[PDB]
């Protein structure tokens, strides 16, 4: 199984790569997605960078092209990698990945055009030579050939995939969202509006039936959404994505049987200056799991519980198939079910804002006897059924609480189970050698009936322990926690689990004596720390303060981080002084042809340009209309205009200045133009600079609102090239034929 966050090394400072990738590993992510943007590495038709070097005023020294170090660091952290090296990446990036010199080379991008595709072969030779050692090391596990070619031409994506299958033998090669592929695997990018499970379930059910025997993945699940200028909103444009929603989509995808999931932006981070799409913010925070500034959001902890379950029960979850044999007793939750070789899962989804109480019928009997299954509002609960705990006498017949984790410590299996405060969960344990005894700590109620112990637990802000003993001397330790302490549980080693209030657990030094971990504490992080391990913990200290220990059982230590340790603080810092300088604006000027894009003149960067136009006017000003405007029309995405050194107007693609300061003879017009980015589709050449022109008067304004809509069908499919269609459109036939 692949459990991914997407974390873009080109949007995260190189110093913070370990800080962000270890936050993903600590969530239970076992793989990193990233793009490898072509224009990040070859900005200027020169040499592919692949280092910490930078040669743009708008890209800070701490952003890096050193993908080889990001791949080695993902290797150090034990993360696998999905490389998305496409010539096109989308991703709200500048030109969606294309370097802005290709617009001089090719009129028909994302195609088998010999103009475009020759330069894509040079890019794939560059990036696949960088990837090869990390692919041979099994760090890079899958290559994604481009984002979202929705329109279908198999020829283009198969040539992309054939270059990869030539340079990188035997890897996974696949497309984001092309419905029309036969041999190349396709993925899905599920971005549904909140509480629209109808579209999410139907897109999953459609997708899971597609391409028999080929790899399934959600290559982009909704981990958040981006923010824009001009039409965007604070959290995201959408406007906020509920953290409850991302978790319901994750648990739904699991319940529908899609094992491989990438959350898209797990961090988001920051756009490096003018490496951003047209109208994007410099924040690419995305409202992600990890916020742009490094904060573990509510979405992080929710996602972390699902990704922890999918590691802890990976053997179960990979053995699953549909089955559809369990029933609900009440229609208050939707049931998504799977059955497997050595266990079963029931995802009970409550899309409502009421609390749901549920029962399941498994073999003509209602399973949880003394408790209902509580299903929280805006929630999906993974109920775990019939699970044979491998190599042991224990069958976890059901748990009404969510299991977070399962682990093996010598004689003992450890399982962590959770519910909300004041939730009653019942867990049934069936022992194939009989129950020898059950020990407990906390509010656990034991009912014993033949080979079964039924464990009814009232969840509270701590751990309740049950230790079911088998006659064979194997043990099952069940640890029952509230939801927020399952959210703040860290497997800091395979033999060290910390159940805690702690905000984050960070880096570790698993020494042969004196183990050390880099905990980060917020004002909630104090209270009990519960440590599960086979190591004989002799003492625990925090920052050379000694902490008190209770050894609850052979594998478990309680200790308390004092409420005096954590601090609440949020300081602000203000200027000593503000100093003003007027820029003279003009360094040196070179001549450009009227209406010519600045990329046709070798200016491949986005950002600020100043035009000087030396416009000629004469007695034809007496032939100008009473409106007397000057209009600057068809320019890239922001300009401030000055006419004969008087400020005249500003705006986005069209400015209609009052022509107050025009004169007979030569008129200087200065246009300080800022190009925010090219758009992040990869099909249209939207030029930077003034691609239009300067115009006089306003004789009229013809509004176009009496449309006839003629129902034309674009012939999308395995033979359809969208770039050929944009260049040579067939609706000319249907315009002639009415």
């Amino acid at each position: 199984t692949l459990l991914c966050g997407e974390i873009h090394y080109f949007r995260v400072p190189k110093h913070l790569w370990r800080d962000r990738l270890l936050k993903l590993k600590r969530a239970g992510g076992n793989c990193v997605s990233t793009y490898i943007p072509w224009n990040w590495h070859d900005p200027r038709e020169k040499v592919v960078n692949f280092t910490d070097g930078t040669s743009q005023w708008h890209v800070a020294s701490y952003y890096s092209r050193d993908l080889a170090s990001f791949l080695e660091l993902a290797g150090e952290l034990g993360l696998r990698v999905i490389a998305r090296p496409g010539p096109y990446i989308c991703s709200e990036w500048d030109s969606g990945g294309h370097p802005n010199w290709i617009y001089t080379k090719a009129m028909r991008l994302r195609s088998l055009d010999p103009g475009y595709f020759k330069h894509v072969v040079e890019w794939y030779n560059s990036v696949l030579n960088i990837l090869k050692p990390y692919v041979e090391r099994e760090i890079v596990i899958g290559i994604q050939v481009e984002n979202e070619y929705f329109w279908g031409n198999e020829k283009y994506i198969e040539k992309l995939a054939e270059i990869v299958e030539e340079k990188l033998p035997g890897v996974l090669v696949f497309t984001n969202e092309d419905p029309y592929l036969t041999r190349i695997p396709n993925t899905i990018d599920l971005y549904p509006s909140p509480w629209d499970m109808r579209q999410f379930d139907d897109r999953l059910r459609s997708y899971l039936s597609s391409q028999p025997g080929l790899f399934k993945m959600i290559m982009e699940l909704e981990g958040g959404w981006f923010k824009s200028s001009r039409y965007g909103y604070y959290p995201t444009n959408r406007l906020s994505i509920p953290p409850e929603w991302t978790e319901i989509l994750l648990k739904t995808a699991v319940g529908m049987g899609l094992n491989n999931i990438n959350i898209y932006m797990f961090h988001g981070g920051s756009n490096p200056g003018y490496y951003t799409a047209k109208y994007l913010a410099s924040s690419y925070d995305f409202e992600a799991c990890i916020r742009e500034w490094g904060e573990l959001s509510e979405r992080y902890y929710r996602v972390k519980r699902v990704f922890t379950f999918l590691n802890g029960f990976q053997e179960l979850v990979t053995s699953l198939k549909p089955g559809e044999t369990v029933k609900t007793a009440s229609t208050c939750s939707e049931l998504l079910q799977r059955v497997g070789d050595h266990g079963k899962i029931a995802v009970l989804r409550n899309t409502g804002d009421n609390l749901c109480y549920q029962r399941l019928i498994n073999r003509g009997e209602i399973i949880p006897m003394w408790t209902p299954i509580r299903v929280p509002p805006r929630y999906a609960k993974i109920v775990l059924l019939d699970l044979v705990v491998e190599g042991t006498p224990f069958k976890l017949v059901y748990t009404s609480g969510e299991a977070l984790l399962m682990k093996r410590l010598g004689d003992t299996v450890v399982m962590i189970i959770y519910g909300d405060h004041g939730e009653y969960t019942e867990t049934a344990v069936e022992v194939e050698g009989g129950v020898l005894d059950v020990d407990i700590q906390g509010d656990v109620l034991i009912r014993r009936e033949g080979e079964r112990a039924y464990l009814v637990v009232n969840h509270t802000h701590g751990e309740h322990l049950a230790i079911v003993k088998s006659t064979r001397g194997q043990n099952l330790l069940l640890i029952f926690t509230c939801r927020c302490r399952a959210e703040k549980t860290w497997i800091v080693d395979e033999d060290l689990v910390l159940i805690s209030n702690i905000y984050y657990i960070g880096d570790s030094r698993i020494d042969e004596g004196k183990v050390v971990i880099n905990a980060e504490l917020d004002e909630d992080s104090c209270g009990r720390l519960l440590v599960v391990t086979s190591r004989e913990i002799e003492a625990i200290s925090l920052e050379d303060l000694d902490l008190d220990l209770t050894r609850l059982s052979k594998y478990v230590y309680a200790t308390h981080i004092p409420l005096s340790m954590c601090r609440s603080g949020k300081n602000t810092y203000h200027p000593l002084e503000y100093r003003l300088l007027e820029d003279p604006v003009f360094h040196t000027l070179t001549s450009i042809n009227p209406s010519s894009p600045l990329l046709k003149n070798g200016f491949y960067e986005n950002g600020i340009y100043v035009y000087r136009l030396r416009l000629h006017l004469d007695k034809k000003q007496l032939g100008d209309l009473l409106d007397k405007h000057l209009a600057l029309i068809g320019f890239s995405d922001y300009a401030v205009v000055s006419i004969n050194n008087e400020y005249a107007g500003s705006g986005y693609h069209y400015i209609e200045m009052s022509a107050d300061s025009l004169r007979e003879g030569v008129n200087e017009v200065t246009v300080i133009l800022e190009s925010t980015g090219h758009p992040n589709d990869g099909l249209l050449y939207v030029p930077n600079g003034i691609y239009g022109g300067v115009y006089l008067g306003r004789v009229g304004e013809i509004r176009l609102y009496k449309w006839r809509k003629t129902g034309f069908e674009i012939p999308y499919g395995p033979g359809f090239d969208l770039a050929e269609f944009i260049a040579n459109p067939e609706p000319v036939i249907k315009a002639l034929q009415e």
Binding site: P13, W57, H58, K227, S228, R230, Y234, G273, Y279, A281, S283, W293, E295, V515, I517, A519, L521, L542, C566, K570, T572, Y573, H574, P575, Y578, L580, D583, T590, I592, P594, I608, Y609, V610, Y611, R612, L613, R614, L617, G634, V640, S650, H653, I672, P679, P687, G692, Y695, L696, V699, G700, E701, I702, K706, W707, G711, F712, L722, P729, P731, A735
Partner: protein, 227 residues
């Protein structure tokens, strides 16, 4: 039949021109512009003009009397208008990439400037680039335990932010938040030279203030287990 032209299909409309002496410049409307550009193909009469780049002079494609516009919108929205102009203006054009203060790296070291009070009025200085240079003390080791956002209070400007010469980001009147994350790799312990390139866009412009806000302050504590 339909007013919207906002959904996939081939839409046709019809309009009339008097003399062909004017310039007819089609504007796609503010509805059209998106970060992922809309696949909308323009035809004027039965002749293909191109995909919609933005505003286009369509005068080449039209004839005296009645004319048609067709739009194969595959995806996205338009609200087309034609502006009609008396002349297109002749003149030689020149460019510079960037600005003098930018290509001299005034974000690393500007000349000295005149001091201003915290409500910096710029609307007089509209049409120009003003560099607002500030020093902010940050008397503690910068860390991801206490991340920094620079908030700029301003209006009427497009402002580029630099911290210690590292380019942090852009803010504009129509940007969705006034805060930029500035990384621990940009921030210094001691004085921070935080510098704004304000391209002054309106007769109303100004910067009202800067603050670095720590979003929170967590304790990174080394937790230790003796075995």
């Amino acid at each position: 039949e339909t007013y919207s032209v906002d959904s996939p299909g081939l839409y046709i409309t019809e309009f009339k021109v008097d003399d062909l002496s004017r310039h007819y410049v089609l504007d796609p409307g503010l509805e059209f512009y998106y970060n992922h550009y809309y696949r909308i193909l323009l035809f004027v009469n039965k002749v293909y003009v191109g995909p919609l780049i933005g505003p286009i002079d369509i005068t080449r494609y039209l004839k005296p009397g009645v004319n048609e516009v067709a739009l194969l919108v595959e995806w996205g929205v338009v609200n087309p208008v034609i502006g009609v102009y008396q002349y297109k203006v002749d003149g030689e054009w020149f460019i510079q990439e960037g600005l003098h203060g930018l290509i001299e790296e005034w974000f690393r070291r500007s000349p000295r400037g005149e001091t201003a009070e915290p409500p910096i009025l710029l609307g007089d200085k509209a049409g120009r680039v003003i560099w607002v240079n500030t020093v902010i003390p940050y008397e503690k080791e910068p860390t991801s335990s206490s991340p920094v956002k620079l908030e700029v209070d301003f209006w009427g400007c497009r402002i580029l932010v630099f911290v210690n010469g590292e380019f942090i980001g852009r803010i504009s009147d129509d940007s969705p938040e006034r805060e930029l994350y500035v990384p621990e790799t940009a921030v210094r312990r001691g004085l921070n030279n935080i510098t704004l390139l304000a391209i002054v866009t309106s007769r109303s412009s100004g910067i009202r203030g800067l603050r670095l806000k720590e979003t929170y302050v967590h304790e990174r504590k080394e937790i230790v287990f003796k075995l």
